[PDB]
């Protein structure tokens, strides 16, 4: 069971799961999640988060085949676990409006507590609105949305990256003054702004593109990827404070962040901290 | 082969590809491809046929599972097959731009033909243009576009029904006197037109909302469809001519339709002898 070779997603021609060796090394039957505990929660009922999830799960490499992705359940659900504790609700939606994809092979089968969160929000996971009608009535001066969350996994690097819809939606976040959350490869989405400097001089923590040239050694993927959003974010302002992966956040003002799967505590801490302070007053 | 109970998808919670005994009654490892010889086919390399494919595989059923769906491949590759045998092009998009999704668990793997003009296209479909960049520069009053293919699989049921896209593309090809080629569920697309009476007094086949109510009593779906496309096209002025199916295709005006899996080959003779007289005229 030790084996490297990509392992055949069935749903889909020459696609592939990670292997299993390298799902034995990046995924657990258990999440690390902890400290989700607020004694003095959102009681306001107003504020709630968006959620811009991945509407595709197969990624294509460099070679032709399909990595078999999807956002990241470990990335996606702890962060909305504290923040859900600190009483906040969420609404997910996709740019197409087709359900979220998750990367299954990384959800933590016997984790109550997460499972527990999805089965809250799968309806939703399952069913998301479309980002364009959110667009249209749900944001502006006087939206009900203290922030946005873009979730990781590599399923953030298929549409998100150059969307026009996204840039509306940073646009808003950023002209709204509203806080921005993500982590690993959600940071690909704020690429959707172009070349309109937005995000200029912004400090952020994001998978390392070196890790990605390498877990395919391992067969995590069964390719490698045809670009690299960490040198595009760089591009057009972004300072990366990681080279490395620790399970590290980083809050630049309203922009908080996450360097991987292993931040998804970290992150649903740092952000539930950054809410409540900002509800307290 | 004997089991009806529904297929796991593995890719995707609570998703079910049909039961093996379903399989075993609705596909086969070879097509019935016939009769694609074109003596002389279209040479003047500039018509092109529109292809709007499904770009979402799990389709949500009454129960809450996901039907794990998308393109049907025979209805797909055998109309394709013939019109190209006549010397059309295509050109393949999706609503979001993500890839075509084909109900792998019905394509022929041991038909030679069928899976090599499946290769000829692999990259279309893998990587499909969007409709909206198609909808943009490629239309007009001076297409290249000698008519619009819509391919059945429940996963047309999808997005296109009420797209406002694929209004566009079906208002478009009506005013401009284009072929509309479509197949089993294929037509449900034609919804997207909403309350434009457009299309008030044609007749066409179409898959039986009778028989989709039937199939999931042998696995073939993991619940039972939410509505009913037949009686929507119906109530917008369509006259379904089929009860059943039998591989039945019909042609009112340039509206060319085919009833189910089963009229893949007749509806690519019939759209390959209608294009390729006009071409001629």
């Given at each position: ?70 956002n990241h359940p470990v990335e996606t659900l702890?962060p909305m ?21 998750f ?48 979730p990781?996994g ?128």
């Amino acid at each position: 069971a030790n084996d490297k070779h990509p392992t055949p997603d069935p749903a889909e021609d020459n696609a592939f799961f990670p292997s299993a060796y390298s799902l034995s090394q990046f995924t657990a039957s258990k999440s690390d999640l902890s400290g989700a505990h607020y004694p003095t929660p959102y009681q306001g009922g107003r504020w709630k988060i968006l959620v811009v999830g991945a509407d595709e799960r197969y990624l294509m490499m460099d070679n032709g085949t399909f990595f078999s992705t999807g956002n990241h359940p470990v990335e996606t659900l702890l962060p909305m676990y504290h923040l859900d504790k600190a009483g906040f609700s969420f609404d997910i939606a996709t740019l197409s409006g087709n359900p979220v994809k998750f990367e299954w092979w990384a959800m933590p089968r016997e984790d109550q507590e997460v499972n527990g969160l999805y089965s809250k929000y799968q309806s939703s996971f399952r069913q998301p609105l479309k980002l364009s009608d959110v667009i249209e009535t749900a944001l502006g001066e006087d939206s009900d949305y203290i922030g946005v969350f873009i979730p990781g996994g590599h399923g953030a690097l298929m549409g998100l990256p150059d969307s026009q819809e996204v840039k509306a939606v940073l646009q808003w976040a950023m002209k709204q003054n509203k806080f921005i959350i993500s982590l690993a490869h959600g940071p690909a989405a704020f690429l959707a702004v172009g070349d309109d400097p937005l995000f200029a001089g912004y400090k952020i923590v994001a998978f390392p593109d070196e890790m990605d040239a390498q877990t395919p050694s391992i067969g995590y993927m069964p390719g490698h990827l045809t670009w690299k959003f960490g040198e595009q974010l760089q591009a057009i302002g972004f300072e990366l404070l990681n080279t490395g992966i620790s399970g590290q956040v980083f809050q630049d003002r309203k922009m908080l962040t996450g360097d991987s799967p292993l931040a998804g505590n970290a992150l649903g801490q740092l952000a539930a901290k950054a809410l409540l302070a900002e509800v307290e007053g």
